[PDB]
């Protein structure tokens, strides 16, 4: 029975600050994050037709990626059914940073029930600008 309850301006701001990289692939992002400290991250366009944006981040010698879902004016990470979401990309990331600070930011390699989760500590956005 239930019913449901500016992205451009944000992305303009994040591009101007440098940490929204626009149309780079997962492989390009891996290169950009190869020599930055663990926890570093960036936002970019997703190559998958089902999504517009992805988060790439460094942890434990690996660059990992996740897609961002955007619906009903809100944002979440993908494959998170039945979540409230956040009203901006920045709010989504800030929430995740706060979870990282508490030891609650973690990932899995499967959504099978019982899949292991692995902690990651996020730090700093990575700028696309050479200085």
């Amino acid at each position: 029975s239930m019913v449901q309850s500016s992205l451009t301006e944000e992305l303009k701001k994040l591009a101007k600050q440098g940490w929204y990289w626009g149309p780079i692939t997962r492989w390009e992002a891996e290169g950009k994050l190869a020599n930055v400290p663990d926890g570093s991250f960036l936002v970019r366009d997703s190559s998958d037709d089902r999504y517009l944006l992805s988060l790439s981040f460094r942890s434990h010698g690996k660059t990992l990626h996740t897609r961002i879902e955007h619906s009903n004016g809100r944002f979440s990470f993908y494959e998170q059914p039945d979540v409230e979401g956040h009203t901006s990309i920045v709010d989504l990331i800030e929430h995740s940073i706060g979870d990282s600070e508490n030891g609650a930011f973690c990932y899995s390699r499967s959504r099978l029930p019982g899949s292991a989760t692995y902690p990651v500590r996020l730090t700093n956005p990575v700028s696309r600008f050479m200085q």
Binding site: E30, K62, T63, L64, H65, F77, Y107, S108, R109, T117
Partner: peptide, 9 residues
């Protein structure tokens, strides 16, 4: 492909 799922909190 190094894509992972963030655990919801």
């Amino acid at each position: 492909n190094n894509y992972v799922y963030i655990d919801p909190t």
